[PDB]
Amino acid sequence: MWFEILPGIAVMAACLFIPGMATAHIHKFTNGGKEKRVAHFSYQWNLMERDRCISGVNRYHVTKGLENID
Amino acid sequence: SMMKWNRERRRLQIEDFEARIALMPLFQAEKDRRVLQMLRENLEEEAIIMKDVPDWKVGESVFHTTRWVTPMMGELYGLRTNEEILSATYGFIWYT
Amino acid sequence: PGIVELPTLEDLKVQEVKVSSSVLKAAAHHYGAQCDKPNKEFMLCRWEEKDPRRCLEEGKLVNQCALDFFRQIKRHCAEPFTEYWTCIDYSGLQLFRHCRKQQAKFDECVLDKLGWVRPDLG
Amino acid sequence: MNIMLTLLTNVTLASLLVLIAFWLPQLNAYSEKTSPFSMKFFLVAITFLLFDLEIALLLPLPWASQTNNLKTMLTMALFLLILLAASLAYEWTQKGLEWA
Amino acid sequence: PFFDVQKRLGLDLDRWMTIQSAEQPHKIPGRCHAFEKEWIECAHGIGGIRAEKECKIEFDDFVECLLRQKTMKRLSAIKRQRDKLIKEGKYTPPPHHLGKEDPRP
Amino acid sequence: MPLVYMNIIMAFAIALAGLLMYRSHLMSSLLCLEGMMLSLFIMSTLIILNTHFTLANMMPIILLVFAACEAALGLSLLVMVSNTYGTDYVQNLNLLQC
Amino acid sequence: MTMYIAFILSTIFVIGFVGFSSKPSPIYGGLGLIVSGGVGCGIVLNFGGSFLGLMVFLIYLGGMLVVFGYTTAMATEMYPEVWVSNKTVFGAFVSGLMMEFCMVYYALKEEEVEIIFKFNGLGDWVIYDTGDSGFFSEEAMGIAALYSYGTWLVIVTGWSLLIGVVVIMEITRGN
Amino acid sequence: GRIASFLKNAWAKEPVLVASFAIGGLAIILPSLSPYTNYAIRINRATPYNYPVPLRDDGNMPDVPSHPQDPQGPSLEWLKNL
Amino acid sequence: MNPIIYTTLIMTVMSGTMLVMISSHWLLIWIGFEMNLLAMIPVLMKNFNPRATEAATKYFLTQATASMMLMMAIIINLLYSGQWTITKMFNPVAMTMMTMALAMKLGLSPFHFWVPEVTQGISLQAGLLLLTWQKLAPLSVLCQISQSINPNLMLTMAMLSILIGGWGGLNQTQLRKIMAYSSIAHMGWMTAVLPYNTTMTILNLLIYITMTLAMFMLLIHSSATTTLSLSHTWNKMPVITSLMMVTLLSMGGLPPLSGFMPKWMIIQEMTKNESIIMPTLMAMTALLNLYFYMRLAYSSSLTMFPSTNNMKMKWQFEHTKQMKLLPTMIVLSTLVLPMTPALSSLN
Amino acid sequence: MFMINILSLIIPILLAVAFLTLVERKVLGYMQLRKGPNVVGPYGLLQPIADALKLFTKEPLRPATSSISMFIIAPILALSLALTMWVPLPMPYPLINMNLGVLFMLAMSSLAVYSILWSGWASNSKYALIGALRAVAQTISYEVTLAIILLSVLLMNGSYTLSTLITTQEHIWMIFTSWPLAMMWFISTLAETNRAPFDLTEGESELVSGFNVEYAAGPFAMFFMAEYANIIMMNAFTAILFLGASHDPHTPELYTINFVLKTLALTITFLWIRASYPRFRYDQLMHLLWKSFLPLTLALCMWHISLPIMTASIPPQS
């Protein structure tokens, strides 16, 4: 009956779910377990560039904390 | 509900802008030092480059005014690597 | 025309505040509250002079004051602040909202050990 | 470079499918199969253009709401919207909106 | 026939956008605000004929800031001679310009 | 001037030449008009963005507002010409002489 | 190669202009205009004008020429004229590309080309400024100031659009 | 009287136009009489988009604070209560 | 066309010209030109004929090209100076392009070819608006940018305009085409003094506007578009053709009629600047204009051409509509010469 | 890895389109007391594969004989733009994060009409050309309201950035704030996607097959895929704009599930509408937009401009 429609909807649901989960996890993998930083304004990009210089491995997601000080 | 939440959002935006204000002087000092160091490196490498060229002053200002002019991207990153140049020019535009 | 008087490399060498953006943003309010005087002096110098070269010493003082601020934080409130900035670092926008509890912990510790009061809105 | 990559990939994928759908199935062996009025209602299309212009003029409004002269901004925004409404009303009443 | 109705009635219909050094939203400065301000302050009330020569220095600096023809010419010369020396092999770019040192933050 | 300015000015010159040398169709000439407007938009936008003339970033938009007005006028004339002659051909605009 | 994306795009822009300027059937002319509009959007985006360039993509490509196409369709010609259809069209198309190539080569080979103006062959990245705009999009604020500063422009443009509607009606009346 | 007849006819025959004209009229009129519009202006002013450039202290500026967290200067308490 | 709409379109044309003559920002001046074109096009097609549509299309194409060149010149001047203000133009190429665009808008040769055709296509009233009001805005723009104008280009265009206006008129039996060629010649006369003294250009423009207003209103009153239709007028309204003859003599520049003073003052200013050959050639070339004016006068008033029997019907009736300003326009066009020293008012 | 992300966006969307076809067939059947395709595979899951293979193996007829370049570009453009419009959508993190992704999607939708415009013309037939013209008018007519409604609702967002829509609707759905706009926007999506009751373009009952009457085998399949991909994308845009979802930054899976479910609900609503109502007459379609909707959208736009000012709820720009 009407439940027979459900399997196609479920396959479509999985297919639609795949890209969002893929994007989230790819961002996590590329940005070191943190969300990809969002730079909608030049100040945020300047912060990202400063982090890249500070990291020393030329990767912004690498974060240097109080340990680098003194 | 939207009025309440938007007022709170503007409050949080004011807070974040205040944080940016607090951090701005340090960034200005760092930027000024970086710009001056890059210019000095360019000038030294330029003297080495154009020592043999006749009638070339090194580091002669192109403007008549004896006033600081913010250097263009070309002055600062003229002889750096292409990756640095691409970053400095198009990083914010391209980053998504 | 004239030769540009770029300052030497040695004079522009300063100790650097090698901390990532999230670390700075975590301490941004207390950093502004404590280190205001040198920062305001440097800003006034930059805006009046309109020459980056003229105000190098003020920038050095700003950097030194920031380093002292972070040294005090490391001495007295190291762990709460580390937790705060690790929380902030996760969010792509580095939003303050998601880390209110860690912010409260850090503010409480800093108020106790160092007496700093977070500046209010506006 | 990310947006350029996306554009390239999408265009290439679609064109690849068009190739595999225009030439690849065209190989299959077969045989021989043999094989305007002046629209004056195009006025609707022209009116779309002049309305799309107001559309463009109205897009900056979200950032326009961030000014300090909110009184002037609101007056001018409502002025543009009222002029658009007046244009629509004029075309309506003069039977200019003779669709199809 | 330029009836200066704006000046007569004190209405700023279009003079706000006439120059780059005029007031701009959130006080965003123009790329050549200083030069333009100097050129206008020099060429104020002296007439166009006088301004064309008594403020020529300011105007030349303004034009250079706008177009940077001379700056690009100088930089092109520098790049030409650097390529020439590299071909001759009597020059070697410094390691920091090659990316072997971390740039200052 | 960088080479991009040269290219865009060349594009405007080419579009102008195309407009001044009709072949048969009026629509092609109106295409050249719209094209010249594009060149002008791109040139103005590049100038304003490079010079950080914040308050002039709206000038390209007004230019396009009036570009589309001109295009619309051109099409509104072209339809009438086609109705009176059956084609958009330029050679039919021959009644008025000298 | 990514160093001269702006130059590559400008060359494509010039090519599209030669395409619609040689006057094939307005269909191909429309194609050339559409390509040129997209490419101009690309150049504007590269210079930091995201909003402005996107405007061309919508109010120019999907706007002025979207009807240009709708028009040509109503006035259908017997044959789709192409560049090769007329020897002159093809010849002019080739000559236009050649003209671009000549100036392009001269500009690159001769550090300073001078056709009618003086152009330096250095990459466009040179002219860019090293300043920071902070938490702002300068293009966005300038465009949004049309309501706060450019009230006079708003009045004149709105009046022109209304009179344009009236004018188009009157022209298409036909008595 | 006749106005009521016109309104009834309009609502019976062209309800969409009636709704549109009512909404537009309210959009025109209501902001003028709304007390919160000045609050919106003040909020937009308070946003610190650009740096608050310090001013040289000549010893005759009592009102301008010498340091944040000082009682002198503007206050944002009204927004926090809002 | 509904009369309210006609009034709105005319007010839009006048508002475009006022924006041109009022704005200090180049973008707004170009906007005013765009408004002028947008409002003008339907006005030219108030009476719908294939000729009206053809004239509108030609005029639109010409003015659109002129506006595009003008905007390119503005953009180039912006690129090289960063100034939007109408002032000295800082790039010679931009100056030349702007001069070509404004000359094309004014109908100065060798951009004159559209003026006779458009004038013939449109009605007498639309022709009056085209040949009197439309000239105001480009002339204003040129006067504001007069100093930047390269004198050689402007003078060459002026001399060519005078020559071509004189030549074309000799061959024309259509009244509207004659008026268009006369307009071309007088525009050349006005633009001749533009580099030297703008007040002389304003004075010539005012005199020309009065004369053309009078001539077009007389033609409208006589309802004649051809030389023979005007010849028939002596039988019906002899006063009209007599006043037409006087206005034609004024347009020729004959002393003591008012048409003499603009030529006289232009020659004066040019001679003060050591220009002697150019004024001499312009004055001599005006004789062609004078010739076809005289031929029109012979056809109209001085000689009585044959009428038709049906004119006896028109004798009984009288003209319904009265153009109020026609008498004053005639008087100003013919008898203002004793009052030249008042040329310091517009100064 | 960015190419991997592009493929992860592209291929699953195509599979979703393929199975959306089956879903449509079964839903329409059940609302008509019928059973959808069920012979081909368990509960009909293999039907799209059969349909695609049958289409591809079918004869490639092409009596266009005019601007074959256009006759090939039109399917390419349609499919490419359908795939591209999915890129800026935040689910919850967008593939490409644009400050103006909304205007980008509007421009891409406007461009996508050229696919129908060219296909019908290069076909050089009768129904094809006239049907293509009717298409231009339809999409063009509703593009106006689409933009106005979108601008009106984003006045609360504070930007054209799609990602911030999640933040704005964190506490409540924007449908509660702008349901009249929501209804008009939904009808607008229906018109833009050329779906019943506005399926005038194809319009099988009136025009044999519309613009695709001269397209067969693979190119017809690409047009079908583009149509269905546009349907899913427009419903996803509706879901993001109005039916916001809770997003936990540490677990994006919850938001992704919620968003996918809402988009599925809206697509099922599209099929439901296709089943229920008959088709609007071409003339009635335009009458409903320019004369009925356009006004109310203007009034609501004035209101949504005025409300933040008079309620002091101007959203933050950043």
UniProtKB/Swiss-Prot annotation, chain D:
Coiled-coil stretches? none
Which family, according to the similarity comment? Belongs to the complex I subunit 3 family.
Q: Where primarily located?
A: mitochondrion
Q: Which GO terms describe its cellular component?
A: mitochondrial inner membrane; respiratory chain complex I
Q: PANTHER family given for it? A: NADH-UBIQUINONE OXIDOREDUCTASE CHAIN 3
Origin species, per record, is: Sus scrofa (Pig)
Q: Which Pfam families match?
A: Oxidored_q4
Q: Which of UniProt's keywords are assigned here?
A: Electron transport, Membrane, Mitochondrion, Mitochondrion inner membrane, NAD, Respiratory chain, Translocase, Transmembrane, Transmembrane helix, Transport, Ubiquinone
| Reaction(s) catalysed (UniProt annotation) | a ubiquinone + NADH + 5 H(+)(in) = a ubiquinol + NAD(+) + 4 H(+)(out)
Q: How does it sit in the membrane?
A: Multi-pass membrane protein
Q: Give me the segments passing through the membrane.
A: 3-23, 41-61, 72-92
Cite the EC number. Answer: 7.1.1.2
Spell out the molecular function terms from Gene Ontology.
Answer: NADH dehydrogenase (ubiquinone) activity
Q: Name one GO biological process term.
A: mitochondrial electron transport, NADH to ubiquinone
Q: What name appears for this protein in its UniProt entry?
A: NADH-ubiquinone oxidoreductase chain 3
Q: Which InterPro entries match?
A: NADH_UbQ/plastoQ_OxRdtase_su3, NDAH_ubi_oxred_su3_sf
Q: What are the subcellular locations of this protein?
A: Mitochondrion inner membrane
UniProtKB/Swiss-Prot annotation, chain G:
Q: Which reaction does it catalyse?
A: a ubiquinone + NADH + 5 H(+)(in) = a ubiquinol + NAD(+) + 4 H(+)(out)
Q: Keyword set for this entry? A: Electron transport, Membrane, Mitochondrion, Mitochondrion inner membrane, NAD, Respiratory chain, Translocase, Transmembrane, Transmembrane helix, Transport, Ubiquinone
Give the location in the cell: Mitochondrion inner membrane
Q: How does it sit in the membrane?
A: Multi-pass membrane protein
Q: In terms of domain of life, where is this protein from?
A: Eukaryota
Q: Does the keyword Calcium apply?
A: no
The EC number(s) attached to this protein equal 7.1.1.2
Q: Where are the transmembrane segments?
A: 1-21, 25-45, 47-67, 88-108, 149-169
| Cellular compartments per GO CC | mitochondrial inner membrane; mitochondrion; respiratory chain complex I
Molecular function (GO) terms listed?
Answer: NADH dehydrogenase (ubiquinone) activity
Q: What is its main location?
A: mitochondrion
Which InterPro entries does the protein's record reference? ComplexI_Subunit6, NADH_UbQ/plastoQ_OxRdtase_su6, Nuo/plastoQ_OxRdtase_6_NuoJ
Q: Name one GO biological process term.
A: mitochondrial respiratory chain complex I assembly
Pfam families given in the database record: Oxidored_q3
The top EC class, named as a word, is: translocase
**Subunit and partners:** Core subunit of respiratory chain NADH dehydrogenase (Complex I) which is composed of 45 different subunits.
- So what family is this one in? Belongs to the complex I subunit 6 family.
Summarize the protein's role: Core subunit of the mitochondrial membrane respiratory chain NADH dehydrogenase (Complex I) which catalyzes electron transfer from NADH through the respiratory chain, using ubiquinone as an electron acceptor. Essential for the catalytic activity and assembly of complex I.
State the name under which the record lists this protein: NADH-ubiquinone oxidoreductase chain 6
The uppermost taxa in this organism's lineage are: Eukaryota, Metazoa, Chordata, Craniata, Vertebrata
From Swiss-Prot, chain I:
Q: Where are the transmembrane segments?
A: 3-23, 25-45, 59-79, 89-109, 149-169, 178-198, 200-220, 237-257, 274-294, 325-345
Note the InterPro entries from the entry.
Complex_I_Subunit_2, NADH_DH_su2_C, NADH_UbQ_OxRdtase_chain2, ND/Mrp_TM
According to the UniProt record, what class of enzyme is this?
Answer: translocase
- rRNA-binding: is it a keyword of this entry? no
Chief place where the protein resides = mitochondrion
* Keywords carried by this UniProt record: Electron transport, Membrane, Mitochondrion, Mitochondrion inner membrane, NAD, Respiratory chain, Translocase, Transmembrane, Transmembrane helix, Transport, Ubiquinone
Catalyses which reaction(s): a ubiquinone + NADH + 5 H(+)(in) = a ubiquinol + NAD(+) + 4 H(+)(out)
Q: What does this protein do?
A: Core subunit of the mitochondrial membrane respiratory chain NADH dehydrogenase (Complex I) which catalyzes electron transfer from NADH through the respiratory chain, using ubiquinone as an electron acceptor. Essential for the catalytic activity and assembly of complex I.
Q: Could you tell me which PANTHER family the record lists for this protein? A: NADH-UBIQUINONE OXIDOREDUCTASE CHAIN 2
What is this protein identified as? NADH-ubiquinone oxidoreductase chain 2
Source organism of this protein record:
Sus scrofa
Record lineage: Eukaryota, Metazoa, Chordata, Craniata, Vertebrata
Which gene carries the instructions for this protein? MT-ND2
From Swiss-Prot, chain J:
Q: Which Pfam families match?
A: NADHdh
What are the protein's UniProt keywords? Electron transport, Membrane, Mitochondrion, Mitochondrion inner membrane, NAD, Respiratory chain, Translocase, Transmembrane, Transmembrane helix, Transport, Ubiquinone
Q: Does the keyword Ribonucleoprotein apply?
A: no
Topology class, membrane: Multi-pass membrane protein
What is a single cellular component term in the Gene Ontology annotation? mitochondrial inner membrane
Q: State where the protein is found.
A: Mitochondrion inner membrane
Enzyme superclass (EC) = translocase
Superkingdom per UniProt: Eukaryota
> GO molecular function, one example?
NADH dehydrogenase (ubiquinone) activity
* PROSITE patterns referenced in this protein's UniProt entry, alphabetically: COMPLEX1_ND1_1, COMPLEX1_ND1_2
Membrane-spanning segments = 2-22, 68-88, 100-120, 146-166, 171-191, 223-243, 253-273, 294-314
**Catalyzed reactions:** a ubiquinone + NADH + 5 H(+)(in) = a ubiquinol + NAD(+) + 4 H(+)(out)
Q: Name one GO biological process term.
A: mitochondrial respiratory chain complex I assembly
Q: What is its EC number?
A: 7.1.1.2
Instruction: Tell me, in a sentence or two, what this protein's role is.
Output: Core subunit of the mitochondrial membrane respiratory chain NADH dehydrogenase (Complex I) which catalyzes electron transfer from NADH through the respiratory chain, using ubiquinone as an electron acceptor. Essential for the catalytic activity and assembly of complex I.
Q: How does it assemble?
A: Core subunit of respiratory chain NADH dehydrogenase (Complex I) which is composed of 45 different subunits.
Q: Which family does it belong to?
A: Belongs to the complex I subunit 1 family.
Know the name of this protein?
Answer: NADH-ubiquinone oxidoreductase chain 1
Q: Which gene encodes it?
A: MT-ND1
